[PDB]
Symmetry: D2
Subunit: 494 residues, 4 copies
Amino acid sequence: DLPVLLTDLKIQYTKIFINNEWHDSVSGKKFPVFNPATEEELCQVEEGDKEDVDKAVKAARQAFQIGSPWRTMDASERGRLLYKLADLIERDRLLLATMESMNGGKLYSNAYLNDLAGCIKTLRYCAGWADKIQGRTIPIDGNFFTYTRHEPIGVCGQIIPWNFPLVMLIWKIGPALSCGNTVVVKPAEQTPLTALHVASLIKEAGFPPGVVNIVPGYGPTAGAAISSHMDIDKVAFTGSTEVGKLIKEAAGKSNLKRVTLELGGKSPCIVLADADLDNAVEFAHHGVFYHQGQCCIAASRIFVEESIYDEFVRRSVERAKKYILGNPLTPGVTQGPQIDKEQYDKILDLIESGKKEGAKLECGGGPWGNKGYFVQPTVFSNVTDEMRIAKEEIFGPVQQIMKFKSLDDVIKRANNTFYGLSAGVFTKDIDKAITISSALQAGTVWVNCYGVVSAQCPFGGFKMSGNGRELGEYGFHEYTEVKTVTVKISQKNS
Amino acid sequence: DLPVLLTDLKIQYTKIFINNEWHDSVSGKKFPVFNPATEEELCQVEEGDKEDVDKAVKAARQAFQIGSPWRTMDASERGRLLYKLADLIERDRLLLATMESMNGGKLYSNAYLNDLAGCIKTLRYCAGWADKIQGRTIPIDGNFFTYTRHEPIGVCGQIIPWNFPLVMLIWKIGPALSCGNTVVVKPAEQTPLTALHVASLIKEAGFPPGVVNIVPGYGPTAGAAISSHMDIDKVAFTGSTEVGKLIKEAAGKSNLKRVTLELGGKSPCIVLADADLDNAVEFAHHGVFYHQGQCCIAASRIFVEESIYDEFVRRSVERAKKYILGNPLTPGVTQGPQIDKEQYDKILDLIESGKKEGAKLECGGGPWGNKGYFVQPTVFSNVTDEMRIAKEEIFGPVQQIMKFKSLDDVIKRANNTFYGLSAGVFTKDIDKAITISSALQAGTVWVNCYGVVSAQCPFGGFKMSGNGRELGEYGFHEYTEVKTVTVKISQKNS
Amino acid sequence: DLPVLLTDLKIQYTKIFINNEWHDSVSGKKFPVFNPATEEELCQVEEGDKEDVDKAVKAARQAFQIGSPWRTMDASERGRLLYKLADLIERDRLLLATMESMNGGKLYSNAYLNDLAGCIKTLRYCAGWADKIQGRTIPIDGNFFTYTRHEPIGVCGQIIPWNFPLVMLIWKIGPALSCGNTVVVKPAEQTPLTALHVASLIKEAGFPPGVVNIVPGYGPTAGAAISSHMDIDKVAFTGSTEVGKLIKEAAGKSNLKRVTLELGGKSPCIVLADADLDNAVEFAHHGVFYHQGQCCIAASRIFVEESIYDEFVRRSVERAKKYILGNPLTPGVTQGPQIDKEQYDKILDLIESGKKEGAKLECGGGPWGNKGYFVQPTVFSNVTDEMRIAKEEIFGPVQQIMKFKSLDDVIKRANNTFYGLSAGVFTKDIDKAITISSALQAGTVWVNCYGVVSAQCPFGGFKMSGNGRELGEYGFHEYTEVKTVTVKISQKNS
Amino acid sequence: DLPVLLTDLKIQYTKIFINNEWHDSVSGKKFPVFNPATEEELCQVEEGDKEDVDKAVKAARQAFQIGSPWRTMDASERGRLLYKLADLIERDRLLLATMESMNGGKLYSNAYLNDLAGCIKTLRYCAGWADKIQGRTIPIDGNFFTYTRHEPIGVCGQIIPWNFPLVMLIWKIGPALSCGNTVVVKPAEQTPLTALHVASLIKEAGFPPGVVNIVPGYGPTAGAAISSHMDIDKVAFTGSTEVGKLIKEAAGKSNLKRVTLELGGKSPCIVLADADLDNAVEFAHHGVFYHQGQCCIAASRIFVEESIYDEFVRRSVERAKKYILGNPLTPGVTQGPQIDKEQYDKILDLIESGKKEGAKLECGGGPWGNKGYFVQPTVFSNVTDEMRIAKEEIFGPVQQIMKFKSLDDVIKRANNTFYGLSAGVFTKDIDKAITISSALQAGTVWVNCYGVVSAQCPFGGFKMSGNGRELGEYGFHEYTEVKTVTVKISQKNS
Ligand SMILES: CC(C)CCn1c(CN2CCC(C(N)=O)CC2)nc2c1c(=O)n(C)c(=O)n2C
Ligand SMILES: CC(C)CCn1c(CN2CCC(C(N)=O)CC2)nc2c1c(=O)n(C)c(=O)n2C
Ligand SMILES: [Cl-]
Ligand SMILES: [Cl-]
Ligand SMILES: [Cl-]
Ligand SMILES: [Cl-]
Ligand SMILES: [Cl-]
Ligand SMILES: [Cl-]
Ligand SMILES: [Cl-]
Ligand SMILES: [Cl-]
Ligand SMILES: [Yb+3]
Ligand SMILES: [Yb+3]
Ligand SMILES: [Yb+3]
Ligand SMILES: [Yb+3]
Ligand SMILES: [Yb+3]
Ligand SMILES: [Yb+3]
Ligand SMILES: [Yb+3]
Ligand SMILES: [Yb+3]
């Protein structure tokens, strides 16, 4: 059931958010925000820089001080605030989904039914952990009483990507706040709008001032200022592996701040001859085409056993030829635009290498429309491991299909990459499902499905697809700092 | 009870250890190892470089492959191997302590009674975790069965310091092996000898070849090769904050390998007027003077409430004037040398800044002897927060004592540093012990004691004193990589 | 004789200049330009970035191609264009000086009589070199005819400082164009306006399109894009030593582009007992106070022989107390503001270290007015070599005076710095003038004067005050690339 | 006429040379030096490191002090010392050529007749410049007397390659010493021996102590110590473009030391249809095959007009098939080994890409012998611009031959590279020789010859083949620092 907003969307919040008030940039400058489906400017937003990241950090530091309201309130009350924030987002679900769809080029049905549901559910999940973060008492050698505190780390810098602006904002602030941190958030330059609306709801919910600060701006200026800042205790980043390496270097050079990264992928699927073919086709399809291919976990290499390869390719091409391109706000439209020109260019470039290096083009392979950053859904068969479209993250609607005959070999081929975010295995055989998923060097392995992500389980990459995990019980460890307290006593007893 | 070796020590193992065999360096070169108490060359050891770090990593990678003996053996058998290795070290306790004492300038009583006991106990602790590392089953939304595997990460590069060579070797390899990793270890250039003996025992114990590789050599060559290597999954390092920043940058630039660091400190003690004065004096003393001040956790800033300050200083100076300097192998000797000339120079330099910047010199303040890197135990009173001896890690036998009158102020002063490894609080008041230890930005806080370290509890720094934790249940998390497996099912039931 | 503009200044040129046309920024953004005497915004200018630096470089590259008008025109015609440009600047002298004075906080008398005269004279000087740049014929061994061509290098990136915007623009483009290069100029963010007016005159004079491109914007964005650009053959920069090191690193990492730097100073004067005291006082005064101390060559350490030290200090303080602070456009005003807040802050910070570290404050030492970045002219006597005000470039109206008794010693003290831009020697003795000036590690040494700079002689630093020389016959070498052509012949004759 | 040494060579000088005395390394370590034709160790040499580079620099700095013998001696006497050093090298010509041939794998006829003749001639050339380095007197505006001093820069760090050890040592120290600098030289790790012999002759000739210091050792240790050293005024380096970028970055980060680089090439020849075909074949052949292809200026891309392409290829292959591989000390042998395994590997790797990417292999293409680093002389025809063997410097005996039909196009292809060291043009037409050589982006262009290098003319690269020039009148500018002295006078007269 898909309700819609019964009034044109008005853009209201466009300023820097620090200490629960709206700030103009120190420079005075603003920057444009565009709608990727029309290339039209939607509004202008205040441009944060080093100078503004400093006001946000001083505020975050102040709200983190011993004796402050955020440090002294019950953990259950931190949880309460988070639940309240989720209720408010549920209240503004129609406007946030529309804003998300219009700003981020995201199908409104997905924005409303998937993105907003996931934001609300993940916040509610995080809220429940707040008063269940516990340390330990430990039977140390000698006459001592030893316990641990799982304290918040402190001021956390959090850099949000443009592909899932609201979801990723909540994946970041949810755990960080549940554990008792304060945050300085830099949403993507392309997609700052939904974050600023959420900021208004953070103020409404009653979070103490300085606990969440949101500084829209550019990666090279505001993002660099975060990663190199001397009083930021931790940085979290989701984005390309390329920028991830710069983040990790900047932390090193500056103050050795803790770093977690969720980066790109070139995630493989392995489809065995005994698999339910239609199920494998459908999940692998959605796996690569979801949100215009703009997912870190895109199933961008599909290995299919030789004897069912032809039939897999046929059914796959058939599914890809059913899309309807257009503005993501209109019902019936099933493929929106790419986010922007850089991405658009990179994708078209990569599609050309495919054709040129000699992959079989099954459909698509060019742009679409007179306005927007639209790419036709594209399928390549007979792709080989040396081709650019098998090595590089495309981040576009471009599916690679490959054959294999030997299982040992295809696992080595699946693993033969610096990436390692996710993978898929399709088979009816118990032993193969368990042994293959154990052998894949990937952070999440799906068996007979793909792209199943939930707040209850940890998510992150092996190798250069990331450091650390988000969500689940695990993700909450990355947002605490462990302190051991050891007290001399006259005599211990077990 | 202090038994000794009834024969002169012979140096036996001096080569690179890869695949359970002894290798000459690829270059052919060797480097000298000296005895810091006599400045005499003890032997020559094979010098590992990039080219040799590569042979060690290829071996570690091979031993980590799916289907290998180390990957397929029962976790309980990994535990068994570790227990066996501890029994062997217990068997060679006399020779290892002597080697440690002679190579590292460490008092033989401490080497035998503390270092060797700690190595054996910590290995036995780690051995017991091997088959108790568990993942989770998770009640994800939707019709799915989801579980996690806590897999080993892979090839771990581990860089050991010179101050506690054997203990730190075991803190590194214990957890790493218990979790199922393979390792490439680079002991300190000053102190490679005990590591190479342990390597012989790793072979005797029956570890599969390639599971532990030990490559002696230099930081700038062998250490840099580890930190920048493209097929090393994680690096662990203990040493200075300065080198720690280079390690973290190199990981960033190369392959985004995971990084844990245990770095320096400028650890404070706060002594309240109600404290047991003699107990506080004794622990603070040992806190700074242990092993010639060459401890990351040195209690190098001691803040004492004004009304008991004079009496604390008097008793402290009294204790410091009781040492007997000499070769650490002779009974009755209670202070050995510094490790080497660089450290010796840095310490004497820093002692001069004290005198010059106008701290009150209470005893010591110069070198000792005609041979060795000996520094007189040194105490400064009326030290202030701006002095070099209050800001910089000395890593030498040099105690700083300071007064305070206001508790709020002294906590801010304690916290006013980029370091954050440890701290001490001395008081009889429950509320003060709990509230002060909560307010200190330090990884371990001792109450009415100092320097109490055990395998059962996690150890690591806040801020620039480190990233991550070692030992305890916690340390074992840093040596696993979490994989989520999500399986489509027809219907789930709770 | 000081004529003035008989109409209010209107700001006309505010856009990016590429191929002799005005361009909006690719982003669409603009940035404010302020008047430092009132803190009022004067106008907004188009903000160039990487994306716009690329349009400028492609244009510069195209105008440099073999067969193009700029490459094929007579060298004498390049000279003609430069003379014409000087005539045009002479025509617009009143408006350019006013614009300079208003935008850069520069006394109008100096702007009109010194800056504009220097621009015109230096351009005319450079114009005369164009057809007098010659290579060589060389009597190589063997039967060959060998000659050299002194070709232009190619596309030169030139980054202009804010202290002398027009003068430095001409010091850069004059030689570069005379030698036949094409340029991409990034004026200072504070002072882009006069450059854009000159650009209009470059178009009027008839330079081929693409020979001069001017891209206003920020150092970290537009300046970094220049220094790291892959198709820029050379970068010239005047500014702080700090940024200079980044420029030189960026050139290294990118394309090994040639680099010339004119950086800061901490320039000394040595005043001997036999000097003409009044002359030494007057030149040393102007030496440090010229343009609010905002000169790379500021005489910021004045060493005066003990027996005339007191009298030198008295006369110096007397001269410093005669200033009249105010807006630089009003006659009678003799000290304008500092350029901006960062500089203002740094200066006030440094003045405090003086007082605190215990220099004798003779006058000044605080801000002035309710608007503007005004600092009172400040004099310190009894300054010593360890003080911050003796080691750091202040770049403000702050004079340091020091005593000496031994000539050997004071030369070592003069030289005891990483800087080395300039120095002054005041004496009546021939031998002392020659021997002292030979012994000073400085690029320009004045004898019985200071701050005498002319187009005919080379200007640049020793040590960390710069690499290379500007102006004179010398400066023209830094803008050519030497090609040797060796032709096989049957028989050579002398 | 080829005389030989009438006794087996004995290796005599193997230590670090500082202040005209022989020093053991501070570490105590030595490193092996091998004979590339037999893989046999020739001797061991003292290994210099940071710690030893510091002793060399302190010595160089002391010898450069005002009032020292090297600073105060007549320039003509610096010249005299250099002439004397050349006479001594002429005296030891037989032993130096043998040492060169044995250590560097260089044909003895070439070592004796070319390398040693070039060393002696270039030193004699440099000696004659010493008292002919002059500054200027300059007609500055105003009443001033202005002159310039062309002073030595100071301590120059000089890093010598392994391909022409003695020649390049003299190209570096000749100009540097003639201008009055002091030097710290780091010969290649492969080829330190001839440098150390020359050092003995520098002492014999009577150079003041500290004027030349020679520190054998490794690039990553001794070479890095030079490039990053804080009291070294300039660094000169010849080697790969890759290391060149590190040198230039290190200078930037450290002390902004001046930098000159002579780096790799991928130098083209253009052979027009009207050329003397046999002459073009012979020079292009020697151009690529000289010293086993181990020349920066290797003619590694030969473009031949279509109508004479086949005949050029035939004649070229014919010439390449006439070599005799073996130890370079035996008469009749015409091709020695490659310098070492790394180079050997890189060359064989690159030869494989040729075959694989589909160039026509005309002869060679594999290794030779059971000992040594020998590669068969290799010729490829029908090479195209995208192939690895057309883009990458091979530095081995591997000739690339390509066709062209359009002159405009082939000049663009010649220029379409980041390299730019040299080029060759073969034609009988005056206009084509002049216009083509003007259009080539190369530092040296030969017409109807190749590889003609002499002390009288400047040598260096455009683009990423280097910064600056060596030899000729020009090279001497890179070893001076210009000081302007401006003296106030009552009245000037022309
Ligand atoms: C990493 C994430 C944002 C991917 C988005 N996504 C969703 C919806 N998504 C948002 C709410 C999330 C939450 N609960 O927070 C649950 C997951 N569905 C997907 C995908 C997907 O990337 N791919 C490849 C898919 O195939 N499908 C089906
Ligand atoms: C970090 C560590 C190596 C410090 C060494 N240490 C020990 C003995 N040590 C070795 C075995 C370790 C184990 N169980 O692994 C237990 C701890 N005792 C100490 C200290 C100490 O540094 N300081 C400051 C002290 O005051 N005391 C008393
Ligand atoms: Cl477009
Ligand atoms: Cl478009
Ligand atoms: Cl000593
Ligand atoms: Cl000593
Ligand atoms: Cl202000
Ligand atoms: Cl102000
Ligand atoms: Cl070999
Ligand atoms: Cl071989
Ligand atoms: Yb952009
Ligand atoms: Yb378009
Ligand atoms: Yb050392
Ligand atoms: Yb000594
Ligand atoms: Yb600014
Ligand atoms: Yb103000
Ligand atoms: Yb090597
Ligand atoms: Yb071999």
